[PDB]
Amino acid sequence: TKPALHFLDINATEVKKYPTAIQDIIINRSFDGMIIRGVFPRDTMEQVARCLEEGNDGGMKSILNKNEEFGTKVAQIYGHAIVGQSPDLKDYFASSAIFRQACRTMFQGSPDFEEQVESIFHSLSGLPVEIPTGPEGQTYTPATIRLLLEGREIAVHVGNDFLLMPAANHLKTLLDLSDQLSYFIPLTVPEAGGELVVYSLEWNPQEASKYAQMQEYMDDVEFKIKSNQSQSVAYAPGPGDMLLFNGGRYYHRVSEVIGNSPRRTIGGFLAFSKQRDKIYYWS
Ligand SMILES: [Ca+2]
Numbered sequence: 001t002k003p004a005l006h007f008l009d010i011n012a013t014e015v016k017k018y019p020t021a022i023q024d025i026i027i028n029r030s031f032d033g034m035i036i037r038g039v040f041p042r043d044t045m046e047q048v049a050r051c052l053e054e055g056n057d058g059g060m061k062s063i064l065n066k067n068e069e070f071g072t073k074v075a076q077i078y079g080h081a082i083v084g085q086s087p088d089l090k091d092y093f094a095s096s097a098i099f100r101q102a103c104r105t106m107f108q109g110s111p112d113f114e115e116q117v118e119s120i121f122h123s124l125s126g127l128p129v130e131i132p133t134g135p136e137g138q139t140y141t142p143a144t145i146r147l148l149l150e151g152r153e154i155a156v157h158v159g160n161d162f163l164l165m166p167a168a169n170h171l172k173t174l175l176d177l178s179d180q181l182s183y184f185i186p187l188t189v190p191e192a193g194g195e196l197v198v199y200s201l202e203w204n205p206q207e208a209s210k211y212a213q214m215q216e217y218m219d220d221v222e223f224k225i226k227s228n229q230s231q232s233v234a235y236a237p238g239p240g241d242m243l244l245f246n247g248g249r250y251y252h253r254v255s256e257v258i259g260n261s262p263r264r265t266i267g268g269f270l271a272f273s274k275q276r277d278k279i280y281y282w283s
């Protein structure tokens with residue numbers, strides 16, 4: 001045989017059968033991700049989406065970044081994502097406070113967003129699960145909400161590029177130097193498009209160094225991901241399903257949304273503490 005990408009497809013009721021799934025993806029590399037059906041009920045997802053559409057959102061609209069100047073290959077985002085922020089994190093910590101309050105209000109404890117996701121991550125690892133805190137106790141955000149309208153996409157990228165950004169300076173003191181995972185849950189799905197695609201092409205600073213400009217390297221990534229060479233797997237999770245996968249290691253993208261229903265997702269990242277005795281999750 002020739003090595004392939006491997007993913008599980010399970011129901012949320014079965015997570016306790018995989019008590020070392022996170023270690024198996026990050027450390028052992030025995031598989032690459034999983035889709036977990038029905039982490040949240042469909043009626044909870046619909047309620048949250050309606051809050052955002054109608055504006056009774058607990059203040060969430062006050063931290064919507066429309067990104068209007070950055071082209072069609074970016075989403076709009078509720079909350080500041082830590083990627084790209086200044087290393088002091090002052091703006092990020094303020095938006096993170098607002099995000100946690102607004103999210104808890106919208107979910108009405110039925111079930112609570114943080115409580116439910118932490119339960120999943122604990123069942124797949126056996127470890128305690130925490131949202132990190134800054135050097136003076138400021139909370140990170142557990143998640144951000146990505147909003148993709150008709151004609152918009154999420155350009156191909158890879159998670160371990162975060163380790164090369166000034167915004168990661170403080171988190172680097174808390175995390176093990178292994179792969180970060182990606183997680184997300186759809187609140188609303190589109191008529192067509194909006195598919196997550198994971199490629200076998202990996203993060204590779206050594207290959208990037210063969211190019212005088214990063215924009216030349218990314219032109220070659222775009223060539224490679226459309227060839228018969230790289231493998232690819234595609235998912236279109238329903239509302240309330242979680243996708244959990246090694247986005248730190250593998251290039252991935254979200255295809256252009258088609259139709260009049262927006263794609264809305266809530267999600268972030270997770271990684272090991274330096275002693276591999278705790279899981280941290282954030283966006
Ligand atoms: Ca499709």
Ligand SMILES: [Ca+2]
Pocket residue numbers: 191259260261
């Ligand atoms: Ca339509």
Ligand code: NI
Pocket residue numbers: 157158159182247252
């Ligand atoms: Ni990503």
Ligand code: NI
Pocket residue numbers: 219220223
């Ligand atoms: Ni080209």
